[PDB]
Amino acid sequence: KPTYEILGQMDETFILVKDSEYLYFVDQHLLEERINYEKLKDENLACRISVKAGQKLSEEKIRELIKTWRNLENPHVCPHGRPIYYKIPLREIYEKVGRNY
Amino acid sequence: KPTYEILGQMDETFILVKDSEYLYFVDQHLLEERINYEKLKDENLACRISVKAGQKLSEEKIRELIKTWRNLENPHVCPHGRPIYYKIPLREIYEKVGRNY
């Protein structure tokens, strides 16, 4: 959804961001690779210039990536077929601890 | 595990913290309630003085709570029986995006 909250980074590899329904773990490399691939139409070039796992991203760079993610033609899979993100429904977390959601 | 990383807060309700095997979503109210209950042995008193969901906690307070969590007699369920946390194996997140873990 267009209303979302960025929670931070995990393992310098995933961006955590949620809307009202799901928490998403977004692979930072695959996301930048998709952004660059849609701009450049060259999988190897897109891959080689993108952030790698284990590179620390600033809060601003994370905001830019997540903003762009929502506008991609394919926000779901990188050019090599790997899913860009894992998601979990918020309700699974809330219901485990016995909270209404 | 004693080596862990705090990722931040979600919905002013959960603390996100991981070790090398799992990501934990720790209900801040249930955690403080358990801490206070083990100290005071009074469920109603422990509940009423504890942080509530929707109260913003500082990074320092989150560190204190998570440190104490590991030393509790029962770090799993609050005095009313609700699970204190939800966990997910890190491997589920990594394997979804096609990353070794």
CATH assignment at residue B32:
3.30.1540.20
Partner A contacted by B14 (CB < 8 A)? yes
Asked if residues A84 and A75 have their Cβ atoms less than 8 Å apart, the reply is yes
Q: Looking at chain A, which residue has its C-alpha nearest residue B94?
A: A86
Instruction: Say if strands A85-89 and B5-10 run parallel, antiparallel, or are unpaired.
Output: unpaired
Q: Which sign, positive or negative, has the C-alpha torsion B42, B45, B46, B52?
A: positive
8 Å CB contact of A97 and B85: yes
Give the Cβ contact number of residue B85 at 10 Å.
22
Asked if residues B86 and B43 have their Cβ atoms less than 8 Å apart, the reply is no
Please tell me what resolution, in angstroms, this structure has.
Answer: 1.4
8 Å CB contact of B10 and A8: no
Domain holding A89, by residue range, is 1-101
DSSP 8-state symbol, B79: T
Secondary structure (H, E, C), A18-49: ECCCEEEEEEHHHHHHHHHHHHHCCHHHHHHH
Q: CA torsion angle for A60, A66, A72, A74 (degrees, to 10)? A: 140
| Chain A CB contacts of B83 below 8 Å | 96-98
Return residues 20-59 of A near B (CB < 8 Å).
23, 25, 27, 30, 53
Domain count, chain B: 1
CA distances from B58 to B54, B61, B63 (A): 13, 5, 9
Gap between the Cα atoms of B49 and B66, Å rounded: 18
B8 DSSP β-pair partners: B16
B27 DSSP β-pair partners: B14
Partner A contacted by B100 (CB < 8 A)? no
Give the Cβ contact number of residue B39 at 10 Å.
11
Partner B contacted by A14 (CB < 8 A)? yes
Query: Where on the phi/psi map is residue A60: left (φ > 0), alpha (ψ -120 to 50), or beta?
Result: alpha
Give the Cβ contact number of residue A27 at 10 Å.
25
Asked if residues B47 and B40 have their Cβ atoms less than 8 Å apart, the reply is no
The set of long-range contacts for B59-64, using a CB threshold of 8 Å and a minimum separation of 24, is B59/B6, B62/B6, B62/B8, B62/B9, B62/B15, B62/B28, B63/B6
Gap between the Cα atoms of B9 and B25, Å rounded: 9
